[PDB]
Amino acid sequence: SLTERHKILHRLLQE
Amino acid sequence: SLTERHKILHRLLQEGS
Amino acid sequence: QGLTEEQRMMIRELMDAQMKTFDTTFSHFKNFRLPGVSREEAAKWSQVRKDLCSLKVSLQLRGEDGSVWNYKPPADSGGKEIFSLLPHMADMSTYMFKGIISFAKVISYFRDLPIEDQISLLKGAAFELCQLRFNTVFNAETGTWECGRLSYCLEDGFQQLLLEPMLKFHYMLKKLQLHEEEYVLMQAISLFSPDRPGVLQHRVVDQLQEQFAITLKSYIECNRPQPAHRFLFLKIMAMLTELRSINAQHTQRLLRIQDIHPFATPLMQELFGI
Amino acid sequence: LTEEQRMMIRELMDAQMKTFDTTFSHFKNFRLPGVEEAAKWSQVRKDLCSLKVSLQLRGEDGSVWNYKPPADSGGKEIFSLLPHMADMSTYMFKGIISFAKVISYFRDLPIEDQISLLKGAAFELCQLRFNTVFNAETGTWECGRLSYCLEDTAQQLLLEPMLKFHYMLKKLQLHEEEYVLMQAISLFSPDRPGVLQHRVVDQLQEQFAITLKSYIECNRPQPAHRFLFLKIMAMLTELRSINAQHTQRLLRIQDIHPFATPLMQELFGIT
Ligand SMILES: CCn1c([C@@H](C)NS(=O)(=O)c2ccc(Cl)cc2)nc2ccc(C(F)(F)F)cc21
Numbered sequence: 055s056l057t058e059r060h061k062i063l064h065r066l067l068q069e
Numbered sequence: 070s071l072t073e074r075h076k077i078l079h080r081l082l083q084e085g086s
Numbered sequence: 087q088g089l090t091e092e093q094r095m096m097i098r099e100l101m102d103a104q105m106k107t108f109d110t111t112f113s114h115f116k117n118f119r120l121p122g123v124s125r126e127e128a129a130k131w132s133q134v135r136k137d138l139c140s141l142k143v144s145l146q147l148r149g150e151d152g153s154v155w156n157y158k159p160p161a162d163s164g165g166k167e168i169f170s171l172l173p174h175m176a177d178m179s180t181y182m183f184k185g186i187i188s189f190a191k192v193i194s195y196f197r198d199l200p201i202e203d204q205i206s207l208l209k210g211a212a213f214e215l216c217q218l219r220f221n222t223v224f225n226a227e228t229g230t231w232e233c234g235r236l237s238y239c240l241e242d243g244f245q246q247l248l249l250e251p252m253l254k255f256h257y258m259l260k261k262l263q264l265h266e267e268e269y270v271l272m273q274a275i276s277l278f279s280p281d282r283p284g285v286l287q288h289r290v291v292d293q294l295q296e297q298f299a300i301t302l303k304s305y306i307e308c309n310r311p312q313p314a315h316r317f318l319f320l321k322i323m324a325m326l327t328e329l330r331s332i333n334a335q336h337t338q339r340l341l342r343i344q345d346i347h348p349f350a351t352p353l354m355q356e357l358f359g360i
Numbered sequence: 361l362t363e364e365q366r367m368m369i370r371e372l373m374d375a376q377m378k379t380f381d382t383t384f385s386h387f388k389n390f391r392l393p394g395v396e397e398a399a400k401w402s403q404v405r406k407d408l409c410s411l412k413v414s415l416q417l418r419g420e421d422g423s424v425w426n427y428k429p430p431a432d433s434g435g436k437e438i439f440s441l442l443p444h445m446a447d448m449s450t451y452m453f454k455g456i457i458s459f460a461k462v463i464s465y466f467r468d469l470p471i472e473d474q475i476s477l478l479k480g481a482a483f484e485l486c487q488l489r490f491n492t493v494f495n496a497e498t499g500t501w502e503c504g505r506l507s508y509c510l511e512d513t514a515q516q517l518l519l520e521p522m523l524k525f526h527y528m529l530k531k532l533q534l535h536e537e538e539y540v541l542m543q544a545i546s547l548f549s550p551d552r553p554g555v556l557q558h559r560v561v562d563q564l565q566e567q568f569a570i571t572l573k574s575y576i577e578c579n580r581p582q583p584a585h586r587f588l589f590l591k592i593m594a595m596l597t598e599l600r601s602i603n604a605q606h607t608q609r610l611l612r613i614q615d616i617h618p619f620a621t622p623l624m625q626e627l628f629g630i631t
């Protein structure tokens with residue numbers, strides 16, 4: 055749910 | 070042929086007011 | 087103390103034309119551009135660089151909200167940085183020229199002239215009438231032209247600035263402390279110049295200029311008894327002759343700059359023969 | 361002094377060098393200021409009398425654009441600098457995210473923890489980085505071609521906690537190594553809301569703190585720096601309080617005048 059509410063941060067963290 | 074070489078001025082003068 | 091009825095009506099029309107076409111607050115000047123946030127050829131550049139000094143002004147934009155944007159131009163570091171303010175200058179001049187065209191259009195004596203002479207007169211006097219209008223918003227104390235929310239401040243002695251003819255003109259004219267009536271009569275005298283190239287009704291124009299000059303001389307006689315205004319009419323007439331010389335000189339700088347760095351708007355190209 | 365401590369500092373310094381554009385050469389295309397409800401507005405107006413700075417832009421050609429903010433006149437002038445602020449902050453936050461990403465100790469943490477730590481420390485790491493470009497002599501943050509100068513009021517400035525923070529931190533004259541260890545201590549805060557691996561994070565923070573304390577003992581002569589480590593730790597605690605305060609301000613403004621970028625909305629919990 056936290057990742058779901060933070061897609062941009064999640065994307066930035068995976069690159 | 071002043072009018073022909075100064076299209077903008079000509080237009081502005083014709084618009085009046 | 088007494089102007090003829092014909093003179094009173096002449097001034098009235100001129101003043102009415104001025105009020106209707108001179109947006110002194112520049113509230114309608116918008117959407118203008120702003121500076122971004124061999125051997126013979128090189129000789130042209132040396133000259134162009136000399137023609138941009140002393141034009142140098144800083145620019146100030148006061149927002150309605152009370153905020154202020156200030157632009158300081160770059161020093162001559164040998165390139166195209168010296169042309170940073172030209173697009174803005176072109177927009178300001180074009181805006182002024184349109185107001186000058188409108189001024190001429192509302193004058194009955196001007197409308198009666200053939201379309202060709204209207205064009206010839208405007209081409210010849212556009213610079214002059216613009217500078218006369220700029221003088222009324224010129225603050226001699228601060229060396230700044232106060233154009234509504236826009237301010238143009240001369241780059242910081244006197245003896246040095248007084249070397250630039252246009253600069254000396256502004257200080258000298260401002261010192262005369264002219265009335266609105268005197269400025270508008272100056273504009274009319276400059277507008278109705280019989281000796282502009284291409285004028286055909288040279289006779290009617292010459293007759294009109296004389297009547298505006300007589301009206302100016304009379305206005306001064308009726309309202310300026312103070313010993314501080316001795317020879318005022320003659321000083322004004324001499325200033326108009328000087329302005330005509332400055333016009334020719336600035337026109338030659340414009341073409342020179344245009345030759346190397348085109349920037350004139352389409353209206354400017356028509357007015358100055360580009 | 362231990363080899364392990366040396367390696368820890370090296371990784372941190374490497375991360376900082378790779379992710380801190382000190383000349384702000386890559387900060388571009390940003391916005392610039394144009395050329396019960398009543399109770400909310402009243403508070404918001406007060407939240408913006410404390411977000412004033414004049415802005416200076418030095419062009420490559422040598423020209424200079426200077427922006428002076430408007431005085432509080434009533435409405436929709438107090439928000440003039442918000443879009444620019446949003447772009448600057450977002451730019452800073454991206455650099456902070458990159459910083460954390462290159463740290464091995466951070467990457468090993470669960471994705472959810474990485475998110476929680478970044479949300480909690482984004483403001484803090486940004487301010488620590490801003491301190492390194494802060495000129496205490498001129499009261500200006502020198503950000504490459506951009507400069508932000510505080511507009512003096514009729515010790516006065518020392519009243520604003522964030523301003524007092526910057527002068528106080530600058531006065532300590534810290535080394536790059538000490539700034540980066542401060543960033544690590546702030547980043548690996550076990551008490552951020554939403555952290556699950558409290559144990560591991562607390563242990564990591566302690567190791568960074570021991571490293572900082574050791575670095576100071578080894579590199580700084582003695583008496584004058586006797587309590588430097590504790591002064592740093594006290595400043596970090598203060599920054600955490602300032603963070604909470606600024607966050608509240610942000611939400612209040614956002615509520616009445618949305619301006620946060622999508623990344624900011626995620627970092628500070630804005631729907
Ligand atoms: C070339 C100097 N200049 C001039 C000349 C023709 N006359 S001046 O120097 O008396 C002057 C200077 C500034 C103003 Cl506003 C009016 C008159 N007009 C300008 C208008 C705008 C700007 C510029 F601001 F775009 F640079 C520069 C101008």
Ligand SMILES: CCn1c([C@@H](C)NS(=O)(=O)c2ccc(Cl)cc2)nc2ccc(C(F)(F)F)cc21
Binds near residue numbers: 413446448501503
């Ligand atoms: C609201 C003041 N402020 C802050 C506060 C929270 N801290 S500060 O006053 O120490 C400060 C002020 C200016 C800078 Cl550049 C850095 C830190 N951070 C900002 C970042 C960018 C800009 C903005 F000017 F870009 F809008 C303004 C900022």
